[PDB]
Design a protein around this ligand. Structure first.
Ligand SMILES: COc1ccc(S(=O)(=O)N(CC(C)C)C[C@@H](O)[C@H](Cc2ccccc2)NC(=O)O[C@H]2C[C@@H](C)O[C@H]2[C@@H]2CCCO2)cc1
Ligand SMILES: [Cl-]
Ligand SMILES: [Cl-]
Ligand SMILES: [Cl-]
Ligand SMILES: [Cl-]
Ligand code: NA
Ligand code: NA
Lengths: 99, 99
């Protein structure tokens, strides 16, 4: 698809058996999901941006379905104000910025 | 251009005759630049990032070139870590997300 940017680029994702809405975010290095349980090992991480840093749990090798496209990678879980699909997973679905 | 996301989508911008680096950010509603001098009056704005809210200065109708494309629109100035081109200016340069 072609997604214009008049509004936030929100899509449906499936992660950990749950449907969520998430923002396709080219400015995010990382994928960050609101609090939820995921299987397997995790380790703590700090991520920062506007307003400072938050602590998250880092889960590696997590499968997400993003607008119908399956990907696998690291997913961070913590008190993000919105679910964010960052570049680590946008690359895997072949997303590009065009102008 | 078609910009892939394996690296950060950094471009050169020109604002007030100055070249700067900035991030093309589909997750940003607005454009936010590091402290600099802009002409005219400013209005107050609070923006919310990963870490919380910050105060910025909102300057309207500012001339800005983004990767060679002309834009004229709102620029927020404040303590952002990186210069961010958000959707208010990405729409002016015709940017879309594609996969
Ligand atoms: C209203 O206009 C706004 C409001 C907010 C922002 S923003 O906070 O920058 N933000 C909104 C988003 C968190 C929902 C845009 C993000 O793309 C934002 C842009 C940015 C900010 C500061 C330094 C570098 C890059 N990315 C961002 O915060 O990314 C961090 C969080 C996590 C997802 O990944 C992190 C890493 C390190 C920084 C880059 O990627 C921009 C404009
Ligand atoms: Cl919107
Ligand atoms: Cl990854
Ligand atoms: Cl590619
Ligand atoms: Cl905001
Ligand atoms: Na894992
Ligand atoms: Na102005």
């Amino acid at each position: 698809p072609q997604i214009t940017l008049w509004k936030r680029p929100l899509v449906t994702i499936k992660i950990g058996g749950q449907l969520k809405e998430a923002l396709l975010d080219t400015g995010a290095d990382d994928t960050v999901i609101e609090e939820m349980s995921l299987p397997g090992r995790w380790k703590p991480k700090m991520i920062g941006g506007i307003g400072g840093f938050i602590k998250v749990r880092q889960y590696d090798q997590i499968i997400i379905e993003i607008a119908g496209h399956k990907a696998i990678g690291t997913v961070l879980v913590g008190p993000t104000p919105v679910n964010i699909i960052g570049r680590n997973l946008l690359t895997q679905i072949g997303a590009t910025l065009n102008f």
